[PDB]
């Protein structure tokens, strides 16, 4: 599913994500714009034997099972077949996991170039959400 | 699959440091999420604090900075230490999991001269 | 932090009705609302997680849903195994909260 900005700012309020644990919304949008492009089926395989799902590109090695990564920790108990839906509630309730850590959203490295130190509420403007 | 469980002392003088364990069988600790949490008499539920992936950790501000979370990657363990307990420290302490799918059985602490 | 109140403290039913508890948050916590039952000599067990989110192994007749600040828990016909404390906490915000708590009681 390739979501709309103001779409997916829209669903991720609904799931959540309005100042969960620190960050607004518009982190979540600028993160999943850079990332993925919004595209929920996105996927990239990583140099180091990894790869990295769906609309957040959570990453086979920590976070999901994709039974193909090496030292696969599966920190989110879910294959990574799950992040691929357009349904966001997997990918959301595995964000949720990452960004409890202290690392926070600095985990994404596209929101860390991209987004961090940017006016992140200009993703959220001019929606009805 | 999975199995938690509490151990230590069951009575504690008043100032020490009370000193608890968690083992885990059934996946490594290390990397996880692990947490402590608390219910007092009158069944009050207290979330103490939990360690996280990169080893950062998250601590209860009502502790008041005399609470410190520890995993041993070897034994497979991680630990509860509470400095300076009062008789408002007497409670079931358990150990459970991030997700809050698996907790230990509990272990009554009780503060008493 | 985040005061999340519960009510009623008490509730009695005979086995079969139906009944829903509330858990109301002190700030908007979107969907961050989990639920969990506590029987005697026992741990808390997860029972619903963010808000509405169904839990494998547990019995289909808990429902829950609710968001921002008022959030339920509905018991479809009470079994008897069903009676003890329930417990709705946010996880939001650091740090985490729990509410008082409801008792479940045959009557």
């Known amino acids: 599913k390739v979501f709309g900005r103001c779409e997916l700012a829209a669903a991720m309020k609904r799931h959540g994500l309005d100042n969960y644990r620190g960050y607004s919304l518009g982190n979540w949008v600028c993160a999943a714009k850079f990332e993925s492009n919004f595209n929920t089926q996105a996927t990239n395989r990583n140099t180091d034997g990894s790869t990295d799902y769906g609309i957040l590109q959570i990453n086979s090695r920590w976070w999901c099972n994709d039974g193909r990564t090496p030292g696969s920790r599966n920190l989110c108990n879910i294959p990574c077949s799950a992040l691929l839906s357009s349904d966001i509630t997997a990918s959301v309730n595995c964000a949720k996991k990452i960004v409890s850590d202290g690392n926070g959203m600095n985990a994404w490295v596209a929101w860390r170039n991209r987004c961090k130190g940017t006016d992140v509420q200009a993703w959220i403007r001019g929606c009805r959400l | 699959d999975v199995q938690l469980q509490e151990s230590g002392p069951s009575l504690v003088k008043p100032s020490q440091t009370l000193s608890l364990t968690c083992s885990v069988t059934g996946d490594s600790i290390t990397s996880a999420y692990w947490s402590w949490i608390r219910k007092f008499p009158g069944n009050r539920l207290e979330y103490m604090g939990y360690?996280?992936?990169?080893?950062?950790?998250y601590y209860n501000p009502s502790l008041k900075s005399r609470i410190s979370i520890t995993r041993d990657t070897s034994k497979n363990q991680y630990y509860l230490d509470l400095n300076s307990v009062t008789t408002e420290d007497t409670a079931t302490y358990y150990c459970?999991?991030?997700?809050?799918?698996?907790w230990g059985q509990g272990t009554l602490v009780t503060v008493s001269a | 932090d985040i005061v999340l109140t519960q009510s009623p403290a008490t509730l009695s039913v005979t086995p079969g009705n139906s009944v829903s508890l509330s858990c109301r948050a002190s700030?908007?916590?979107?969907?961050?609302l989990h639920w969990y039952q506590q029987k005697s000599h026992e741990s808390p067990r997860l029972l619903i997680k963010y808000a509405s989110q169904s839990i494998s192994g547990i019995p289909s007749r808990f429902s829950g849903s609710g968001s921002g600040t008022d959030f339920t828990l509905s018991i479809n016909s009470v079994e008897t195994e069903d009676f003890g404390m329930y417990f709705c906490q946010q996880s939001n915000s650091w740090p985490y909260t729990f509410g008082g708590g409801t008792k479940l009681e045959i009557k």
């Open positions: 700030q908007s916590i979107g969907n961050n």
């Open positions: 360690v996280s992936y990169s080893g950062s950790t």
């Open positions: 459970a999991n991030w997700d809050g799918d698996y």
